[PDB]
Design an enzyme around this catalytic site. Structure first.
Site, mmCIF file in Angstrom:
data_model
loop_
_atom_site.group_PDB
_atom_site.id
_atom_site.type_symbol
_atom_site.label_atom_id
_atom_site.label_comp_id
_atom_site.label_asym_id
_atom_site.label_seq_id
_atom_site.Cartn_x
_atom_site.Cartn_y
_atom_site.Cartn_z
ATOM 1 N N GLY A 1 0.793 -1.348 0.010
ATOM 2 C CA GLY A 1 -0.039 -0.021 0.009
ATOM 3 C C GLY A 1 0.990 1.251 0.021
ATOM 4 O O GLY A 1 1.921 1.329 -0.487
ATOM 5 N N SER B 1 -1.440 -0.983 3.747
ATOM 6 C CA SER B 1 -1.935 -2.058 3.321
ATOM 7 C C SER B 1 -0.630 -3.038 2.696
ATOM 8 O O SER B 1 0.238 -2.526 1.958
ATOM 9 C CB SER B 1 -3.052 -2.182 2.643
ATOM 10 O OG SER B 1 -2.501 -1.544 1.203
ATOM 11 N N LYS B 2 -0.731 -4.424 2.620
ATOM 12 C CA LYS B 2 0.235 -5.336 2.220
ATOM 13 C C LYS B 2 -0.783 -6.455 1.418
ATOM 14 O O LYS B 2 -1.448 -7.106 2.188
ATOM 15 C CB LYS B 2 1.231 -5.911 3.124
ATOM 16 C CG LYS B 2 2.034 -4.685 3.829
ATOM 17 C CD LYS B 2 3.212 -5.599 4.655
ATOM 18 C CE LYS B 2 3.988 -4.315 5.390
ATOM 19 N NZ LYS B 2 5.100 -4.784 6.191
ATOM 20 N N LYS C 1 -4.961 -9.720 1.682
ATOM 21 C CA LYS C 1 -4.438 -8.485 1.585
ATOM 22 C C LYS C 1 -4.664 -8.025 3.424
ATOM 23 O O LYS C 1 -5.731 -8.255 3.780
ATOM 24 C CB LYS C 1 -5.424 -7.505 0.832
ATOM 25 C CG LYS C 1 -5.277 -6.043 1.064
ATOM 26 C CD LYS C 1 -5.810 -5.232 0.080
ATOM 27 C CE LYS C 1 -7.000 -4.175 0.151
ATOM 28 N NZ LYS C 1 -7.116 -3.254 -1.056
ATOM 29 N N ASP D 1 -9.592 5.604 -12.617
ATOM 30 C CA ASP D 1 -8.153 5.229 -12.711
ATOM 31 C C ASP D 1 -7.845 3.777 -13.142
ATOM 32 O O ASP D 1 -6.580 3.164 -12.787
ATOM 33 C CB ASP D 1 -7.646 5.466 -11.217
ATOM 34 C CG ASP D 1 -6.034 5.963 -11.370
ATOM 35 O OD1 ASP D 1 -5.228 5.310 -10.760
ATOM 36 O OD2 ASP D 1 -5.919 7.069 -11.908
#
Ligand SMILES: O=C(NC1CC1)c1ccc(-c2cnc3c(NCC4CCOCC4)cc(NC4CCCCC4)nn23)cc1
Length: 257
Positions: free
Chosen positions: A19, A22-23, A38, A132
């Site tokens: 993030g 976050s990972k 996550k 996006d």
């Protein structure tokens, strides 16, 4: 290693991306099956950040049933300290897969489009405009492509492009059409082995060329004529004249033969 979610227990193979707070880890469970967990640490996050995380799980959760082109969510765990999301794990994210392959098979590029279309279509039906889209947002699993995030929460990177940025995004300093463009640029990249503005690298002039009408984009005459039309209709600079998803899903490229 290793992670514990709702009674079940998983060991951490790799770290896919980060993030954010976050990972994402590629993760093995007890039965040697591969998954994607996550992890969001909620200690250093305001209510605006927190709420965007809660909104993300809600929508990912909700959209499970409405399309098999949204990343599966198997289970989750949320406290005041952490969030875990147990999701399906992908073979390869579209970005890196587009980097590796020299030329893309047509029957395969059309299938990924139908797939990109269905996903994006689905989110729009539940009043979400990604805003996006990038190939990094897509993923290959069991043949298909799958949208993985909704632009709702903060974007993650592997372990800062604007190629796909729509003209109306930068011109305003809320429209489904904004996704249509980015889907166009992705299809472009899959068509002409490059994004439409890859030639430029200087941002201040790239962001300026995206919006510049005088700056004509190339569409090298190609075998598939339907396809050449989609790209053109997709990459119109005027939102109201740019093709819609329902139109795009009724197009001869996706429908004929
Ligand atoms: O956060 C996610 N979705 C939001 C909550 C709604 C999410 C993030 C990643 C995945 C996922 C599952 N498998 C893979 C996945 N599989 C490919 C691995 C497999 C083993 O070799 C290395 C890549 C890659 C990959 N690429 C990165 C993630 C971080 C940001 C940029 C894109 N993401 N990913 C799924 C959901």
């Amino acid at each position: 290693e290793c992670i514990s979610v709702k009674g079940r227990i998983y060991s951490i193979l790799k770290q896919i991306g980060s993030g954010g707070s976050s990972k994402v880890f590629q993760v093995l469970n007890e039965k040697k099956q591969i998954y994607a967990i996550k992890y969001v640490n909620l200690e250093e996050a305001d209510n605006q950040t927190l709420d965007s995380y809660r909104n993300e799980i809600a929508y990912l959760n909700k959209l499970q049933q409405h399309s098999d082109k949204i990343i599966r969510l198997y289970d989750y765990e949320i406290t005041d300290q952490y969030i875990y999301m147990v999701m399906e794990c992908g073979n390869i994210d579209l970005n890196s897969w587009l980097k590796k392959k020299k030329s893309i098979d047509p029957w395969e590029r059309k299938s990924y489009w139908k797939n990109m279309l269905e996903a994006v279509h689905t989110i729009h039906q539940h009043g979400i405009v990604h805003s996006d889209l990038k190939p990094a947002n897509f993923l290959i699993v069991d043949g298909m492509l799958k949208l993985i995030d909704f632009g709702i929460a903060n974007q993650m990177q592997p372990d800062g492009t604007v190629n796909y940025m729509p003209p109306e995004a930068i011109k305003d300093m809320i429209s489904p059409k904004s996704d249509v463009w980015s889907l166009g640029c992705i299809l472009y990249y899959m068509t002409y082995g490059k994004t439409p503005f890859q030639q430029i690298i200087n941002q201040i002039s790239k962001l300026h060329a995206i919006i510049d009408p005088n700056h004509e984009i190339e569409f090298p005459d190609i075998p598939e004529k339907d396809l050449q039309d989609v790209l053109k209709c997709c990459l119109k600079r005027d939102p109201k004249q740019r093709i819609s998803i329902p139109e795009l899903l009724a197009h001869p490229y996706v429908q004929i033969q």
